[model samples]
Target chain A: PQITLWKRPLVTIRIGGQLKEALLDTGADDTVIEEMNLPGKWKPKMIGGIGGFIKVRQYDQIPVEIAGHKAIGTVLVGPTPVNIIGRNLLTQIGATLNF
Target chain B: PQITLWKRPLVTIRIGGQLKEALLDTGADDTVIEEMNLPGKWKPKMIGGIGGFIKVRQYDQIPVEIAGHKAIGTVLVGPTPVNIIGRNLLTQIGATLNF
Candidate 1:
């Protein structure tokens, strides 16, 4: 799939048996989701952003389906403004930036 | 140019008479740079990110070259973790996400 940047590159993703829309963020190093209740044990982690940083729960080896493409990687649940699909999982799905 | 997600999709951008490396961020709605001085009458603005929001100086119609590709749009200067080339500028370069 090819997505233009003329608009937000939002895609449907399935994680934790739930469907949600997320932005394909080429700038982010880690995949982060809005705070949510996910099953299984998770480790506490902290990630930095524009202004500062925020603590999050890190879940490893999480299976996710991004726009029908399957990937299993680390996912962070945090107090994010929006759900972000970052380079961590983007590589697994072979996501690329093109011009 | 096609960029893989295996590494950070960083590109050289010329802005404010300075050359700096920045991330091509599809998830960001606006272009944001680290604190820098530029010749312009900018307005104070605010932008949100993964964690929260931050205030920024917004300079309109600023010219920029991304990896030799040229574009002009709104540019923000603030205390961001890294310089970000967001959708506002990405569209000018005809950037897209391909998988």
Candidate 2:
């Protein structure tokens, strides 16, 4: 019954102080920073997952800007699926879906 | 080279018609869809990964627009790393990094 597919605007982003360009997806539900790119003093924390909760660590807060918009938040420092653009920050900005 | 640690922004997002707020991460490299969140008609497919290519399925576009900018893309429907905003989507938009 569907006619077209829905796609959300994506922004290229970078993490860590090194500033590596990564992806920003609103489809995601959390902010994640690659553990491989993390620096020092990044703490680990236990977080929630789809099934249940997973053990994740809290790292640094890299300054981020996308589509001329900017924000600062905590990055889940760990070895994850590249990165994720979770909802924590999106709701603050008042985002809407397109499909 | 030693002063402050780095961090990233986590955006809040909603999935499915349920419209639940979630965290968006930029440290991810692929778009991940929550299998648990999918409707009753999404198909599954196998894909590659950091460890190796895993099995995933594509689903409906739930409509995502943030900061006045919007996009249309496939939502990886599967049970993996919550939801991720990978490099595939980020590099499209020219986003800068701050630290």
Candidate 3:
């Protein structure tokens, strides 16, 4: 389905066996989710934000289900106002922006 | 044009009568840019960030030209790492998300 940009592009996603809402953010370089106890192999990483840099746990090959599609990519877990689905995962789901 | 999510959806835009490259950020609610001393009806405001809130100037009735399309809306000026054109202006240009 096509989503209009009149409002925030928030969608339901299944990650880590938990269903959550995340924004389809094209401005972000990486997919960032709110703090959650995730079980996976991870490493420390830093993300550059609009305000400053933030340290997060990076998990690779994480499966994210959204918009009737599934994408496996790196998912960053850290403190965030909301869950954000960035290009890293969006690309795998074949999401595109059209005008 | 249809923009694939494989890469950053960076585009050229004209704001404040100056041309600059900005990302078409679907995740952002408002357009935010680095400081340029823009003049308009603005007031100091705080924005939520990774660590804490940051100060930004909110200007209204701002004109922005992107992808050969033009629109006027609110623009926030702050210490952003890069320029982001958010939903406020994107809606005016009828951008949509497609899979």
Q: List the global CA lDDT of all models.
A: 0.92, 0.48, 0.89
lDDT of 1 by residue, B1-99 (tens): 889988888889999789999999998899999999888899998998766789999999999999999999999999888899999999999998999
lDDT of 3 at A60: 92
Which has the greatest lDDT?
A: 1
lDDT tens per residue, model 1, A4-96: 887889989999999999989888999999989888899999998886789999999999999999999999998988899999999999988
Give candidate 3's error at residue A12 in angstroms. 0.7
Residue B13 lDDT (model 2): 48
Clashing pairs in 1: none
Model 2: per-residue lDDT, tens digit, A6-87? 2333456544434444444444456765666555566667665433455567765555554445666666766565655556
Model 3 chain A lDDT-worst window of ten: A46-55
Candidate 2 off by > 4 Å: A1-9, A37-40, A48-54, A92-94, B1-99
Chain B TM-score of predicted candidate 3 relative to the true chain B: 0.94
lDDT of 2 at B30: 50
lDDT of 2: 0.48
Looking at candidate 1, what is the lDDT of residue A83? 95
